[PDB]
């Protein structure tokens, strides 16, 4: 089959974490053992090309030739923490993987046949149409989840298959079933490379090669059965009823340089060195966008707790606000009530958008894994995520809010005013969400992002135009009002509502105001707040919000593009 | 030493999770093994009296007598997840435990000598004065943390010592060191009972007794060395290089009723049954309050990230608000600016108090463990926590806010007004924090509590008196304004500020107002909002806030008192 050989590998990150290491991994089960920080995982990443080539200082060859550019696309890699979509079924996950990884020339029938073959091979036919783990709906067993992860990487029929801790977190019987399946797959001529953690003898007997690493150094590389003999010849006795893997780890724990020199002075080292010296996008943009959006939307529907909670909160807020403000009046209290309700609606659209920091943070590991494997470009992933999760969920609350409250309150009864209000609330929601994405994209934890979002929104709320009267602020500070998302929305809503209204019953101030301090019309109130009375004074707010949306989405895209994905 | 015997135990919770189980545990290492859900942990809790006596249906005797009332006080219990205070040192944790568990008649010198003995026995003299694990400061190793947990339970010199998974989460060498220490302690005549998870042969050889449980049933009880012989006589062969514990678990996994009957039909069962048939506050309230408050305050100082973040946010908000509102004026815009800034200060005191849901949630497991062990009463714990964490941290922001903004803004320049403002902001902070405690006390997770707090505060903010004008609300809804914490604070601040002010330059409306709609004095503004002009109209707000504080703190105390602590 395929023979992976690594010669004189050195990896430095500038500390060195992988010293001189060399070996050969042939078809069959090849295992890597050692302490948690020893370097089994680092070696696995280096051999899989999942690491930046800066630190690499060695030679890797497959069948005696250097690794080609499309190596990551032609070799499967199974991650330790499963990244299968829980809200989908086994066949759905396999269909997504097959759609994005296999060439599009193949018909849908051929892809379905290949998926059928893979399902049969891994023995998933019982659960072929079951949701794989929801945490709101019960899912299949952990062994079936791991088998699904293996199946997604087997769709493209790889020659080399990497696994990272394929047994950690599983039960003993499940672990044995997993490794027996791996053993069956290895006999077919498939090269399987994996790292394990504290195996058992039942597990240990199945290997064909063993590579022991500790503190970045090669303690032993050779056939698995001969490790015990090597360590006995080193001068260590094996007690009965003792697991050999536990024996090797006990030897390592208790020096390391001594065992390293001993291995170099061994015959296996000479044979390996002699052999080493002897040897020396698939799919379109639209296709990826469609499938990314489809999977994201299915995940949104299948895990609806958060979305339902947001919609219920929106409806309850709408009904309560409609009851509290029912029947606005054109008297001394009309200005206060109108300004208060519009201010609340705008700042609510801002504060309820801080949950958009979780759009890209929750799926970061899945994104990096699938980008490395060549599923899609960053552009199509970004646009599909925006089109499926951001677009409808930030659009529904605006429609619900206006439809509920507009006629309970008795806002301006024209159709243009109704639709301008709905559109303005939508634009505020999109701008706030885009700012949250720009701040949070490409990060692993949301705590600092959430704190920054909340502080920024509190400062923007103060500059909206209700709490401080923007015309009174000092000039060296006043320019900060142009960075306020709520200010543009609040200004547009006030312009839409207050124009042409009277608030002093019995007193007609449209012609002239008799007393100088009365504030009897909507125009007087708007000008006192610093708001322009022309139609451009309405629409420049929407121009500003649109420009903010574009800028923030571009920043989020760039932060995803230049993210270190390794 | 002390002999713990359990006869015909049945535990039902009404599913039964512990079927007929009986045995005897003598001095030396006694271990309990089995699957995760098998019942090793349930048996350990039942034998330690850490479970409600409702489900218990058996007999437990120590040296042939029933367990006395003060059994939990005289027997140490080491929890799986360590509960040692990270911000303290080893000697500090031991001093706290010794102060609350040993009788107060002993001098401080005797307690210090006992702590010295315990430190020597566990070999912690190297790290006797080091912070035990901070997550903001590097701490001692996991083995030393576990040894500290064991030391806290050894202060009172117990005869019986329970441990729950004393090796889970540790390294192999650390696990061996821990169990060797346990073996040394057991030879001194101390009865040690513990449950383990997948031990090694090096671990397994150290036991003196073994009790195997699976699916609530007793698979085997007898000397540890004879388990292999029993299972061989059952008809199961042991392969070489196999850990016996893994062998027993493999037997169990593969029926259970068959092995249960086999064990009943064994000679060990007969011997155990024959033996069983043969057999059949320390400190004052003030002391506890002082020490609880001392430890809580040290923990607050030693882990200051959150407190520093809150103070920095407060100072930045204060300076920015002072700059934005600098120099309030007595003109048409004076009313809007004064009302806006006071509204922001009050609602900020409410929203920044939702982080008080973490006062009792974070330390729930520590509270339950220490309450069961008889460290303190719930009253002294509750009061010490209030006196150390709630009292100063909710007092600082009010002082900082008033001191910074009062003279930048130019609020009323009397001393009484300054101190009334400071006191009012303090009362708002305490009321909001008390409501958060009442909602969150006695719970494990804060998500639902945080959601309820935020929704309640948003509804209270709408009823404060700026966004809706309380005199205009319909009668069947208007009564809801009496539940609003921000409303009382905002009313008091407005009463304090607006009385005696003019806002129409050139127009003297103190005598009479020439035009009917002008709003030229602070009295007119206050009456339009529904606020009483008498001095009682100021102080009834503080009466309401004080009553709310008392009611909410009483609810929080009751929820801690009737919490199921088992």
């Amino acid at each position: 089959g395929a023979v992976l050989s690594f010669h004189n590998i050195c990896y430095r990150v500038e500390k060195e974490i992988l010293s001189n290491i060399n070996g050969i991994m042939k078809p069959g089960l090849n295992a890597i053992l050692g302490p948690t920080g020893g370097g089994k995982s680092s070696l696995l990443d280096v051999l899989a090309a999942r690491k930046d080539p800066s630190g690499l200082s060695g030679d890797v060859l497959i069948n005696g030739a250097p690794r080609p550019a499309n190596f990551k696309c032609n070799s499967g890699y199974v991650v330790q923490d499963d990244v299968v979509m829980g809200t989908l079924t086994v066949r759905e996950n396999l269909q997504f993987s097959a759609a994005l990884r296999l060439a599009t020339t193949m018909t849908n029938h051929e892809k379905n046949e290949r998926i059928n073959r893979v399902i049969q091979e891994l023995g998933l036919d019982k659960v072929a149409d079951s949701k794989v783990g929801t945490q709101f709906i019960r899912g299949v067993s952990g062994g079936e989840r791991k088998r699904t992860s293996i199946g997604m990487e087997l769709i493209t029929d790889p020659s080399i298959l990497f696994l990272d801790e394929p047994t950690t977190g599983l039960d003993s019987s499940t672990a044995n079933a997993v490794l027996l399946l791996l053993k069956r797959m290895s006999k077919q001529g498939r090269t399987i490379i994996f790292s394990i953690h504290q195996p058992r003898y039942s597990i240990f007997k199945l290997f064909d090669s063993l590579t022991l690493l500790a503190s970045g150094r090669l303690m032993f590389h050779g056939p698995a059965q001969e490790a015990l003999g090597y360590f006995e010849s080193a001068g260590y006795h094996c007690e009965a009823y003792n697991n050999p893997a536990d024996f090797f780890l006990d030897i390592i724990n208790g020096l390391i340089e001594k065992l390293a020199e001993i291995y170099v002075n061994s015959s296996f080292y000479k044979e390996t060195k002699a052999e080493l010296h002897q040897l020396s996008y698939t799919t379109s943009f639209c296709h990826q966008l469609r499938w990314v959006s489809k999977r994201s939307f299915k995940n949104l529907l299948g895990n609806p707790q958060a979305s339902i909670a947001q919609i219920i909160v929106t409806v309850v807020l709408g009904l309560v606000i409609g009851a509290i403000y029912f029947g606005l009046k054109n008297d001394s209290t009309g200005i206060q009530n109108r300004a208060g309700v519009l201010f609340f609606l705008t700042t609510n659209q801002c504060f309820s958008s801080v949950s958009a920091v979780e759009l890209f943070v929750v799926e970061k590991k899945l994104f990096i894994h699938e980008y490395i494997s060549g599923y899609y470009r960053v552009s199509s992933y970004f646009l599909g995520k925006l089109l499926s999760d951001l677009l409808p969920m930030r659009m529904l609350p605006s429609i619900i809010f206006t439809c509920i409250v507009y006629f309970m309150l008795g806002l301006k009864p024209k159709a243009d005013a109704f639709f301008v209000m709905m559109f303005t609330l939508m634009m505020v929601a999109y701008s706030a969400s885009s700012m949250a994405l720009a701040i949070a994209a490409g990060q692993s934890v949301v705590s600092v992002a959430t704190l920054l979002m909340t502080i920024c929104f509190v400062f923007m709320m103060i500059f909206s135009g209700l709490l401080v009267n923007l015309t009174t602020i000092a000039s060296w500070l006043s320019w900060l009002q142009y960075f306020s998302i709520p200010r543009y929305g609040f200004t547009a809503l006030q312009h839409n509502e207050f124009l042409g209204q009277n608030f002093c019953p019995g007193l007609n101030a449209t012609g002239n105001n008799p007393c100088n301090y009365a504030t009897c019309t909507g125009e007087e109130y708007l000008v006192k707040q610093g708001i322009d009375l022309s139609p451009w004074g309405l629409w420049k707010n929407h121009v500003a919000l649109a420009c903010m949306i574009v800028i923030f989405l571009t920043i989020a895209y760039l932060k995803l593009l230049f993210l270190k994905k390794y | 030493g002390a002999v713990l015997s359990f006869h015909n135990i049945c535990y039902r919770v009404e599913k039964e999770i512990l079927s007929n189980i009986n045995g005897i545990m003598k001095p030396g290492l006694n271990a309990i093994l089995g699957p995760t859900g098998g019942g090793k942990s349930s048996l350990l809790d039942v034998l330690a009296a850490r479970k409600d006596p409702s489900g218990l249906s058996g007999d437990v005797l120590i040296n042939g007598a029933p367990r006395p009332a003060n059994f939990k006080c005289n027997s140490g219990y080491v929890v799986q997840d360590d509960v040692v205070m990270g911000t303290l040192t080893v000697r500090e944790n031991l001093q706290f435990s010794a102060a609350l568990r040993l009788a107060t008649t002993m001098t401080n010198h005797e307690k210090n000598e006992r702590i010295n003995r315990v430190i020597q026995e566990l070999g912690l003299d190297k790290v006797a004065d080091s912070k035990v694990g901070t997550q903001f400061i590097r701490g001692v190793s996991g083995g030393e943390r576990k040894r500290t947990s064991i030391g806290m339970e050894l202060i009172t010199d117990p005869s019986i010592l329970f441990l729950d998974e004393p090796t889970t989460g540790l390294d192999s060498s650390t696990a061996n060191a821990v169990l060797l220490l346990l073996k040394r302690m057991s030879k001194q005549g101390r009865t040690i009972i513990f449950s383990i998870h997948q031990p090694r042969y090096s671990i397994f050889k150290l036991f003196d007794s073994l009790t195997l449980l699976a699916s609530g049933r007793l698979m085997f009880h007898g000397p540890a060395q004879e388990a292999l012989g029993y299972f061989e006589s059952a008809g199961y062969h042991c392969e070489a290089y196999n850990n016996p514990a893994d062998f027993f678990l493999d037997i169990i996994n593969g029926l259970i009723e068959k092995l249960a009957e086999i064990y009943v039909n064994s000679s060990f069962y007969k011997e155990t049954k024959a033996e069983l048939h043969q057999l059949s506050y320390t400190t004052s309230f003030c002391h506890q309050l002082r020490w609880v408050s001392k430890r809580s305050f040290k923990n607050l100082l030693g882990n200051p990230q959150a407190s520093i973040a809150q103070i920095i946010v407060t100072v930045v908000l204060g300076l920015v608000i002072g700059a934005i509102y600098f120099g309030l004026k007595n003109d048409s815009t004076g009313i809007q600016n004064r009302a806006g800034v006071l509204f922001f200060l009050t609602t900020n005191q409410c929203f920044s108090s939702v982080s008080a849901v973490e006062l009792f949630v974070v330390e729930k497991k520590l509270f339950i463990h220490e309450y069961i062990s008889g460290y303190y009463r719930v009253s002294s714990y509750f009061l010490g926590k209030l006196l150390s964490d709630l009292l100063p941290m909710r007092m600082l922001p009010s002082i900082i806010f008033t001191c910074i903004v009062y003279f930048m803004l130019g609020l009323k320049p009397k001393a009484d007004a300054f101190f009334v403002m400071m006191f009012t902001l303090m009362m708002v902070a305490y009321s909001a924090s008390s409501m958060a405690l009442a909602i969150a006390a006695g719970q494990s997770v804060v998500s639902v509590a945080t959601l309820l707090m935020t929704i309640c505060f948003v509804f209270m903010m709408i009823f404060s008196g700026l966004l809706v004008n309380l005199t205009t609300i319909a009668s069947w809804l208007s009564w809801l304004q009496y539940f609003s914490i921000p409303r009382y604070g905002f009313t008091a601040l407005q009463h304090n500020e607006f009385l005696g002010q003019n806002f129409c330059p050139g127009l003297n409306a103190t005598g009479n107002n020439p035009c009917n709609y002008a709003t030229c004095t602070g009295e007119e503004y206050l009456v339009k909002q529904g606020i009483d002009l008498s001095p009682w109209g100021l102080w009834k707000n503080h009466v309401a806030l004080a009553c709310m504080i008392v009611i909410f703190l009483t609810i929080a105390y009751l929820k801690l008192l009737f919490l199921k602590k088992y």
Partner: antibody
Amino acid sequence: VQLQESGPGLVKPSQSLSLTCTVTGFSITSDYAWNWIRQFPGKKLEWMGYINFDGGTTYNPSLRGRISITRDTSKNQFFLQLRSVTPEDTATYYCATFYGAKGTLDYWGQGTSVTVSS
Amino acid sequence: DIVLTQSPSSFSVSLGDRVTISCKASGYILNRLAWYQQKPGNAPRLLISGATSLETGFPSRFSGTGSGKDYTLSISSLQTEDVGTYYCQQYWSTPWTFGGGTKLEIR
């Protein structure tokens, strides 16, 4: 500036009462608010409602749904309709004017008596 | 709503005497108070607005004072043309309410 009520002086119970005020010397669409006030026997005054110069209305809450005030700007008139009447609605009815910059009821009508009997 | 209470429902006086009529509001009114005089067979006639300002067409014998919740109408040297009924009215809040009225009488 000059107001005058008119309408039927007798109403049967459960019927509807209708009155008219004709304004001369000022345009009801120009400035003020235009009110209806009644005085019971055993003299006590009750304000009922007004119609504003721009057509908005405001009513006394003690007359829920029973009162409507409308206007006819071509002939400078505003109207009162009080429906489902009872003998407790026996009173003298006045129309009056309210400025608003001042706040008081400056000009009154003559008053018309309405009896609700059978 | 705001309830207005006049203390005496009736008041007996003689010519040239001094009369004082009192009105109490249940809430703060802030000088938004008016006084009306009604003769028998006529509509009420505005006498004082703003609690102090006297209307043109009335003698300076009438004056009004007050603040807060208590207001008074004062007549110095009562004459024959001053006999009638007097009402206070608040126009601070939108359900405008009248007082019960005080009927002056001659002894």
